[PDB]
Amino acid sequence: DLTISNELTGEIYGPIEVSEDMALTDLIALLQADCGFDKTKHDLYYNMDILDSNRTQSLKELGLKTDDLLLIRGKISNS
Amino acid sequence: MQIFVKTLTGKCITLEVEPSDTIENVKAKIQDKEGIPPDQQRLIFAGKQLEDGRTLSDYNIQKESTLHLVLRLRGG
């Protein structure tokens, strides 16, 4: 139940179906394409924390469940 | 009818509503339970945003509908 909410532009996306066998980078790709996320000039808020380089763990390791939500923030006045 | 509202914190809340219930009224029920002000409450159903001045039947919201409650946080 991927709940992508880009509160920077006020754009909410539809609920995407995720899987444990799904690569993190694959999801990130969709995020950078559809949502417009960026791993250089954007900050990814996972639940209540930031996706740091230390968190190289995949979805099935980060703790994905029935409710998966990704918040897009950062940019300028936030980072 | 009963609906399911999932918050960003990963909480599944069930609310008792009617097909003729207004979105704003639903927000009031959320406010009464969670305490979060209606102004900071952004409800989205199936990717479609719900306006306070609209009803559940307007968005075809039926029983056991899964809604997403986004909170417009001023800080981050």
Curated annotation (Swiss-Prot), chain A:
Induction: By DNA damage via PDR3. Residues 1-79 form the Ubiquitin-like domain. It is found in: Cytoplasm; Cell membrane. Signal peptide: none annotated. Belongs to the DDI1 family. Present with 6510 molecules/cell in log phase SD medium. Aspartic protease. Appears to act as negative regulator of constitutive exocytosis. May act at the level of secretory vesicle docking and fusion as a competitive inhibitor of SNARE assembly. Acts as a linker between the 19S proteasome and polyubiquitinated proteins like the HO endonuclease and UFO1 via UBA domain interactions with ubiquitin for their subsequent degradation. Required for S-phase checkpoint control. Forms homodimers. Interacts with RAD23. These interactions are mediated by the UBA domain. Is also able to bind ubiquitin and polyubiquitinated proteins. Interacts with the SNAREs SNC1, SNC2, SSO1, TLG1 and TLG2. Binding to SSO1 is promoted by the phosphorylation of 'Ser-49' of SSO1 by TKP1. This is DNA damage-inducible protein 1. The gene is DDI1.
Curated annotation (Swiss-Prot), chain B:
There is a cross-link at residue 76 (Glycyl lysine isopeptide (Gly-Lys) (interchain with K-? in acceptor proteins)). It is a peripheral membrane protein. The modification Phosphoserine is found at residue 65. Changing residue 7 to D: Impairs ubiquitination by CRL2(KLHDC3) E3 ligase complex. Changing residue 65 to D: Phosphomimetic mutant that binds and activates PRKN. The modification ADP-ribosylglycine is found at residue 76. Changing residue 74 to G: No effect on ADP-ribosylation. It is found in: Cytoplasm; Nucleus; Mitochondrion outer membrane. It comes from the Eukaryota. Changing residue 76 to A: Loss of ADP-ribosylation. Impairs ubiquitination by CRL2(KLHDC3) E3 ligase complex. No effect on ubiquitination by CRL2(KLHDC10) E3 ligase complex. Changing residue 54 to D: Decreases affinity for UBE2R2 in CRL2(FEM1C)-UBE2R2 complex. Changing residue 68 to A: Decreases affinity for UBE2R2 in ECS(FEM1C)-UBE2R2 complex. Impairs ubiquitination by CRL2(KLHDC3) E3 ligase complex. Impairs ubiquitination by CRL2(KLHDC3) E3 ligase complex. The record marks 54, 72 as: Interacts with activating enzyme. The modification (Microbial infection) ADP-ribosylthreonine is found at residue 66. There is a cross-link at residues 6, 11, 27, 29, 33, 48, 63 (Glycyl lysine isopeptide (Lys-Gly) (interchain with G-Cter in ubiquitin)). Exists either covalently attached to another protein, or free (unanchored). When covalently bound, it is conjugated to target proteins via an isopeptide bond either as a monomer (monoubiquitin), a polymer linked via different Lys residues of the ubiquitin (polyubiquitin chains) or a linear polymer linked via the initiator Met of the ubiquitin (linear polyubiquitin chains). This is Ubiquitin. It comes from Homo sapiens.
